[PDB]
Amino acid sequence: PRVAVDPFACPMMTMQRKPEVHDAFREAGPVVEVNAPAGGPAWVITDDALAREVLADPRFVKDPDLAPAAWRGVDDGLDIPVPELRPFTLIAVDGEAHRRLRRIHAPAFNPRRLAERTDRIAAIAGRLLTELADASGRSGKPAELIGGFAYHFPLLVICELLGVPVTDPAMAREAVSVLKALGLGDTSALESLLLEAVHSARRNDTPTMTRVLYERAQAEFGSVSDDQLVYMITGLIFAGHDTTGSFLGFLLAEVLAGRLAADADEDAVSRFVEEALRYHPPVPYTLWRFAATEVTIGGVRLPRGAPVLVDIEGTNTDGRHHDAPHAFHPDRPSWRRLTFGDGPHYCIGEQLAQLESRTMIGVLRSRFPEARLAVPYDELRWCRKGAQTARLTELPVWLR
Numbered sequence: 144p145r146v147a148v149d150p151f152a153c154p155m156m157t158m159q160r161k162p163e164v165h166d167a168f169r170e171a172g173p174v175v176e177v178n179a180p181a182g183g184p185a186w187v188i189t190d191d192a193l194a195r196e197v198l199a200d201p202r203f204v205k206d207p208d209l210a211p212a213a214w215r216g217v218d219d220g221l222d223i224p225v226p227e228l229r230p231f232t233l234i235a236v237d238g239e240a241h242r243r244l245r246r247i248h249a250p251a252f253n254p255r256r257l258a259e260r261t262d263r264i265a266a267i268a269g270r271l272l273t274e275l276a277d278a279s280g281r282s283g284k285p286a287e288l289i290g291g292f293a294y295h296f297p298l299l300v301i302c303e304l305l306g307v308p309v310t311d312p313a314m315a316r317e318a319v320s321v322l323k324a325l326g327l328g329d330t331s332a333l334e335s336l337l338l339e340a341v342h343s344a345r346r347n348d349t350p351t352m353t354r355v356l357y358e359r360a361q362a363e364f365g366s367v368s369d370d371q372l373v374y375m376i377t378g379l380i381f382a383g384h385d386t387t388g389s390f391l392g393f394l395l396a397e398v399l400a401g402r403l404a405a406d407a408d409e410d411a412v413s414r415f416v417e418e419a420l421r422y423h424p425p426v427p428y429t430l431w432r433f434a435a436t437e438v439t440i441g442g443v444r445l446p447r448g449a450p451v452l453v454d455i456e457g458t459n460t461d462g463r464h465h466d467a468p469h470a471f472h473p474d475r476p477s478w479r480r481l482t483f484g485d486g487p488h489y490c491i492g493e494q495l496a497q498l499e500s501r502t503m504i505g506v507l508r509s510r511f512p513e514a515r516l517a518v519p520y521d522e523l524r525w526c527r528k529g530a531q532t533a534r535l536t537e538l539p540v541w542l543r
């Protein structure tokens with residue numbers, strides 16, 4: 144069954160709607176052929192249970208050399224490092240080389256080590272929000288939280304966790320996007336900061352995020368160069384703030400639309416964040432996978448080399464398994480989602496994103512209890528192009 148469309152097609156959206164291709168795909172069946180953006184066929188998985196099988200099947204590999212020749216330098220979302228850096232990029236390998244990187248990265252997201260930074264995370268959020276409110280005091284204009292908070296906050300957090308002291312969040316976001324795009328196929332001020340974080344960790348037993356990465360990497364590789372560690376934390380910084388800042392704009396919009404009870408205990412906050420995660424996934428599809436061998440799944444025989452996507456955004460809003468999927472219901476069955484992926488490549492950073500989301504909400508409820516939208520929720524719009532994360536066009540709010 145085939146639907147001759149680009150699955151990344153996305154017009155301007157309201158808060159409530161999801162693009163129509165998701166329904167078109169799902170009605171066609173569990174495994175649908177589509178027009179890959181960079182040329183040739185591709186296949187979308189539209190059922191949650193079969194998606195979880197695909198993501199756990201060793202025959203669907205990340206290996207980007209298996210991508211069609213035409214895509215190189217063309218496809219928006221082809222992650223292809225130079226072959227010498229692939230062993231150091233979590234998203235480009237599978238099997239033993241991948242478990243090696245997983246063993247190095249997991250202790251960096253230790254829940255106790257992360258929780259020790261809670262106050263610091265709340266301080267960063269508090270400062271950013273206070274200056275935005277004061278700026279509104281001065282100007283008589285609303286604060287724009289997408290440009291002013293959503294990306295700045297997680298970027299400042301991850302940099303501080305890695306020991307990279309950042310002074311200009313906007314400029315650091317620009318600079319790390321250049322390096323990220325080079326690594327996956329003026330930044331010198333940022334490069335010096337990362338190299339310094341790496342020097343400091345090689346020299347001090349202070350158990351920063353960069354130090355645990357270095358200790359484990361040195362153990363797993365015998366020897367690791369500064370360039371290889373800089374390249375790895377560059378990856379964490381991008382992944383650590385782009386998906387998160389896109390999602391935080393949606394979470395902020397739901398909180399300020401008044402949908403959270405003012406008496407909410409920690410369980411209720413958790414259920415609210417989970418429902419935001421089901422309802423507003425930043426990443427609509429999993430990263431490209433390729434059949435390393437001919438595989439027959441969901442009744443469809445897939446050829447060797449078949450590009451395969453799991454539909455995160457569609458399965459998250461599938462009416463066969465969610466009651467009123469396009470309505471925001473914190474107290475629904477807090478239940479299955481693919482917002483963070485599944486299987487061996489499940490998001491290693493999820494713990495940090497959950498801590499940041501709770502902490503942000505706590506700073507808002509405590510110090511900005513009257514914050515609210517400055518436009519109606521029905522006037523909010525979001526979009527995405529190609530392979531980038533979904534994001535709101537703007538989020539004007541009165542913080543006080």
Ligand code: HEM
Nearest residue numbers: 233234382383386387390429430482483484488490492496
């Ligand atoms: C709300 C925030 C986030 C969302 C929605 C999200 C989503 C995802 C998804 C969907 C994947 C798997 C993609 C695939 O297998 O096709 C993934 C993997 C990953 N994420 Fe997250 N992510 C978030 C936050 C973070 C943060 C804060 C970090 C680090 C600071 C991070 C680092 C990573 C890394 C390194 C991987 C690769 C894991 C692997 O391939 O083994 N993410 N994420």
Ligand SMILES: COc1cccc2c1C(=O)c1c(O)c3c(c(O)c1C2=O)C[C@@](O)(C(C)=O)C[C@@H]3O[C@H]1C[C@H](N)[C@H](O)[C@H](C)O1
Nearest residue numbers: 220232233234323326374375378381382386426530531532
């Ligand atoms: C020098 O870059 C790296 C070096 C080593 C490891 C890494 C990276 C890296 O850049 C990187 C990422 O950029 C991303 C991720 C990641 O794990 C890494 C590394 O591990 C995770 C991510 O794909 C998802 C889906 O959450 C988001 C993000 O991808 C970007 C590009 C994707 N194609 C997609 O557009 C996504 C939304 O943003």
